[PDB]
């Protein structure tokens, strides 16, 4: 990386023309030039970049993807004052945390909230309890209570939580992935509540994102659960709504994912404090705060001068209200095989495949199996190029030889090949992604996003 | 098609700016303006475009993919009056022929030949059994005397074919498929010399078409067998070469397999006759073919008067003579499953895998059998889009269906389902090539063709 | 190597050996020839093992099936019964017992489906299918169900399916047309729709198979199931007082069950064929000679006419020939298997909702030709790390092994066309896999897989 | 089981009238009925029948099976006094350790020796080093130095091992799984001097166990490296031969894995107390261990006053020299993962598809992998029965329904069955032999 300059890397959907603004205040004060990239797939060209040695100075990203990245020292160590940690909202710290270092300054918040018809209904309920009695009087008039997105577990999630579900328990800086709690007495009771809601025809297993959103701009449905980024669509529609805290369950919260974009400093920077100072005293102030809300906004931010003048507004004052009762999203890469098990269980439970103590327990179990996430691999490349695939990826010939000569079978040699791979080197640094690429096999590539 | 008007779709590697100038003449004469165009990949175009009803009037082309066109009765038969057949040399004729009717106008002919380094080597050798004792004169020098592709099987065939090996019999004008002689005793007697020859480290089995090109046009080695599409980067590269007839074995001549160039018409065209009238009378003249040669030379020509003139040319004289000497390569669709057998005997042969009995024994079997084709594809296609694959080529949902439903386990379904399309349409009209690009997976599409 | 001048004859098990061994001492106290009968476990699958060979027995007893496979590998001798002997045994047997315009084998005993009905729970029995969900109703406040059947193999579901014009494989000149099937037109929907609604109107279960509804008529739990001669007899140890009749009309229309014929044939490399249709002919195909094999078990219905309208003074054995009359003639031909797998995978999920009626029929009109998939289960018969030593004790040679593995990379590939290729020089069905996998020590798996024929 | 009666479980192939002679001796002095009984495969019924609390009193095995055993507590701990331990050799009382417990009593003693045609070679050389000389000699009459079966790696190993191999640390008394020993420096040395061996036509690599045994008891070679079960084939042969030390490599001995025929008792018998008093006073004596010598051959033994008096036979005494200068064979599960590496290791060197190196190194990452022998138990099992096997096994409906929720594809879901499976049990209680015979697949039980 060149020395003595900063360049910043932020999502084309963010307010990137703003963020460059705050580098020119920034720029006329020390003569350091700032140029800000949206580039795409950056954060999977990050890590790639970066392992090298290059890439940009400044990330800018959700702090999910954070952790895999300090797994592999690509993100460097941040020491804010003890004061300028007092400026921002606590929460947010334990979203950028790794091993119990920093390694990044959260920026905004973002949670699921609940959006109702203002028209249709002009007090939403604070309680899941009343929403099957307020169902069937609407139902008179052709319209339903609630509708939202069934098919994807970060929407029914706030409520298998709120009773005491979590996906990896977190003591001492670290997520054990070995204690999952979507078995505990607390998801069983809430998954068991979303279920009864399709048992007594309140909802319909099939509702999806679409279908939902459909429902609700359409003015059909009373309420729905979304994040701020589809308040732009309801907008758009003729429907006067308003957003609010999601309702209790058993009298405690539903606790949403929280998601925290964050702005990460590059391990390879020679200019690791001269970008700190551009994030600390430029960007997260109040001042350059606003100028890339102005381009395109922030929802809520985790700064707290500036989220109360923005919480003037109720819809993102109800985000943080959320995100405040909500639980961080957690920034190793399990999480991916938590996705899939317990998709497959809220699938499993709203359509009569499973009990809801069947689907739970299994979830329990896949969890912490990563097995699924290997096969899905091993489908998504032509097995023509199997063995291509995983010598691009970085594995040595030594271990693929070691595989050849006592397994047998070309589908079972490949699985152990994959799986010692992923042994040796974590996720997620885009390297399955990368790979593919470099073959010729983009059009795979893409698909494996999916 | 538009009526009135001639389009002509001729390969890149072409020389289409003559031929478009033999086509502007032909407007000067006729007001029937001629577009000269060479998109890629035609060979595969063509009969997708061609069974909707639409394409070029004209296809220029190798003779052994018109047997598939022809198959599906997408080209026209042409019936030229006796007078006009005595202008071009018989066995062009036996090319375009199929099911007795002839489907196509021959051009050009192309037949590999000894190549031969007059520097290292001033007289080549006439028979193949002289070659190991002048390669043990030229490795005390550091060269050697012969270096040829040894992983495709068309270069080895001259050899295997010159004392009785033949692939499909042909007789009376019809390829008798129950009839296959790569397991008789000239085969074995052609194939063991080629083998013996890696056995005495004459040759090595893992040189290929790159290698051998290389060593010739470097000066390593004295000898090769290529065909005429090799000579222009003989010419750009610092050897002074030959061009001669191949070496006999046992007494009788190497039979290369001949290519014929040709130029069929579309059976959708409405202006067949148009069509017939600039190929017989404007483009198979001594002009006209002249033109077309000054602008990339065709090789050896089909039409008597003006090969004649070109085999002033000892390059080209050879060349004619090497395919008068071996056999028209069949333009039946059986062709495919043929070369595949015969590559696997002589990589499993040179290599030691197999015996020669043993490797000729089983490509005789496995030389009628597709099977092996259908399998290939299975693993050229992801699994995770096989259903979209065989959806896009045409195979409808009650087939997909009745297979899922009888049909356990996956890759018993996937070979399935491709079976029965086969039974519906026959190869090769390019329709799994198409399907590929057309979701987006070049990659794999390219890497079959391979 | 056979024994000349001499008559060696095998028949199964059930069947009264006993009594078919008399008339051929009786045939040898006129001939000085002795026949030895032979009633071997498995002989259906012994008989092509040691007949290809050109041995075995001279005269084969069989359902009529089981012989066009046997006649196509050239097996068995034609035979030319005189027209006058012809015309004593009763028409359609004939068609029963012929393979490409030739008769094979002599037509012995008839045997099909019929409706058995409790005459304490049921005085009348219904002669309409239509007439059955009413009564279904009554009998379910009382704690009973209509009717039980086996809805598991599609050969006591078919006489439905065929009612209303269902037909496997049309039947002209002298082949069947394997490009003709009848299991997706018009009549096969309406008589498969009809019986899905009665088991989504609760009125059957789709899990009811032999043994379930065998129990629930012999205990008296239900007032009518559908079953050949072949189960009277468990009927009549229990206390159930039973009665056979015609199986009801569906739309105005006969059902159509499967008719099969127990058949003699002569073994093709037999030196004593004449002396096999001089036996058959005038010693067995008489009113004593089936007498006596009558005598020991019953043979049901019987193909010569003369003794049949002396067994039908039994209204049992009347229902089913019947029953047998307005059906059709199992096909002899061994696209047959794929028919069953086919038809029996559509029944099934139609059944129990996997598939709508029009897709499960639509698939089986395909499938019904297809034998793929009864070489993928052989494959999954055998553990594969058995596989090379079970296709060498089949009979494949090693150049054919051999030149598969060459060109076919995955494990499975090669082992479907390890068997496509070794089904195209042998023909289906001699039994070949059953012996193989016995010789290795495989019973377990010999057995898993006739546990499904 | 039943109480105030022996009953002891032994293999057909040892003395088990004479056995039962002493157990009869023993019925005089106590009133205790003994029945000694050698069922088929007992190696594999006693697990079975125990985990119900029936089987016999006493199992007679080799010491390698009862780690397995001890695993699952099938077997009393047992706490001889000093004074009893002090009259056998020591290292025997290693091999019936586990957990730092002791689990049977040690009996016999077996390892590999040096047989040589002593009309051939009257010395045999005391150096691996010598043999390419040698085997030049006497290839100059037809015949070659040195034959034995180089498939298998139980018989290559002791030279691999001399200068420094070894299978898994001992440390006081559990083995370290994370710690094997075939890719260092002595390992390489090892298996470097057999494959050179083989590069100068000392031996070939495809000799196998009926090769090496054909070729010296037809007198065509002059040494062969085999245990005490093959002397009686040589006896009947005209050889006439001699049994000495393993030659040593690099100056340091050649070290055979030794195995121990060994006693151990029923957890869940309530006649311990009586099997110990047999076992102890009765069986492991010098009277008691001749009258099943008498009957069978016992080879070497573990008490040291009955040994010294059958050491007096020069066969005798060199099996166990080669026994004390080798080590004791690892009673863990582990070691099927490690033989099957090693085999693979071995053949693959000494037919040049792979460096010695390369192989060791191979073999060290799939010595601690199990999932080659997962896949080999799916291909030993028709794959229609696949589910029903893994019922019978004994896995949860909740663990098969586990994997069937998210794995799509059918071999994918029996191999993370089986593997999860093998998480929650472990190795080897003859379950996979068990389950097989009640599903009537004994072609596959045997097969395997």
Redesign the interface.
């Known amino acids: 990386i060149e020395e003595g300059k900063l360049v910043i890397w932020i999502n084309g959907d963010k307010g990137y023309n703003g963020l460059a603004e705050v580098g020119k205040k920034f720029e006329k004060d020390t003569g350091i030039k700032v140029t800000v990239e949206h580039p795409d797939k950056l954060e999977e060209k990050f890590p790639q970049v970066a392992a090298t040695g290059d890439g940009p100075d400044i990330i800018f990203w959700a702090h999910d993807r954070f952790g895999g990245y300090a797994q592999s020292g690509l993100l460097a160590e941040i020491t804010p004052a003890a004061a300028f940690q007092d400026k921002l909202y606590p929460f947010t710290w334990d979203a950028v945390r790794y091993n119990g270092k920093l390694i990044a300054y959260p920026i905004a918040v973002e949670a699921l909230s609940l959006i109702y018809n203002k028209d249709l209904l002009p007090n939403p309920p604070k309680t899941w309890e009343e929403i099957p009695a307020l169902d069937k009087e609407l139902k008179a008039k052709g319209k339903s209570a609630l509708m939202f997105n069934l098919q994807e577990p970060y929407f029914t999630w706030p409520l298998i939580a709120a009773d005491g579900g979590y996906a990896f328990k977190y003591a001492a800086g670290k997520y054990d992935i070995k204690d999952v709690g979507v078995d505990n007495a607390g998801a069983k009771a809430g998954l068991t509540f979303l279920v009864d809601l399709i048992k007594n025809k309140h909802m319909n297993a099939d509702t999806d994102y679409s279908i939902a959103e459909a429902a609700f701009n359409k003015g059909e449905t009373a309420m729905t659960i979304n994040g701020p980024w589809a308040w732009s669509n309801i907008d758009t529609s003729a429907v006067n709504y308003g957003v609010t805290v999601l309702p209790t369950f058993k009298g405690q919260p539903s606790k949403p994912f929280v998601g925290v974009l964050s702005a990460g400093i590059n391990a390879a920077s020679p200019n690791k404090e001269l970008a700190k100072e551009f994030l600390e005293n430029y960007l997260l102030t109040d001042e350059g705060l606003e100028a890339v809300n102005k381009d395109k906004p922030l929802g809520a931010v985790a700064l707290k001068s500036y989220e109360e003048e923005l919480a003037k507004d109720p819809r993102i004052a109800a985000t943080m209200e959320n995100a405040q009762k909500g639980e961080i999203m957690p920034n190793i890469p399990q999480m991916s095989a938590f996705w899939?098990?317990v998709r497959?269980?809220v699938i499993?439970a709203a359509s009569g495949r499973?009990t809801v103590d069947?689907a739970l327990?299994?979830a329990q179990?896949?969890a912490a199996?990563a097995?699924?996430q290997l096969?899905?691999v091993?489908?998504?490349?032509?097995?023509?190029?199997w063995k291509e695939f995983v010598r691009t990826l970085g594995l040595r010939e030594?271990?693929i030889?070691?595989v050849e000569?006592?397994?047998?079978?070309?589908?079972?040699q490949q699985?152990?090949m994959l799986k010692r791979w992923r042994q040796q080197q974590p996720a997620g640094l885009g390297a399955i992604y990368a790979a593919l690429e470099r073959?010729?096999?983009?059009?795979?590539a893409?698909?494996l996003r999916s």
Chains 1, 2 share one sequence.
Do not use: K, S
């Open positions: 899939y098990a497959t269980a499993n499973q069947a327990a299994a179990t896949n199996r097995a699924a096969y899905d091993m489908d998504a490349v032509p097995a023509r190029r030594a271990e030889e070691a000569v006592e397994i047998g079978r070309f589908r079972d699985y152990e073959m010729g096999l983009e059009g795979c893409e698909d």
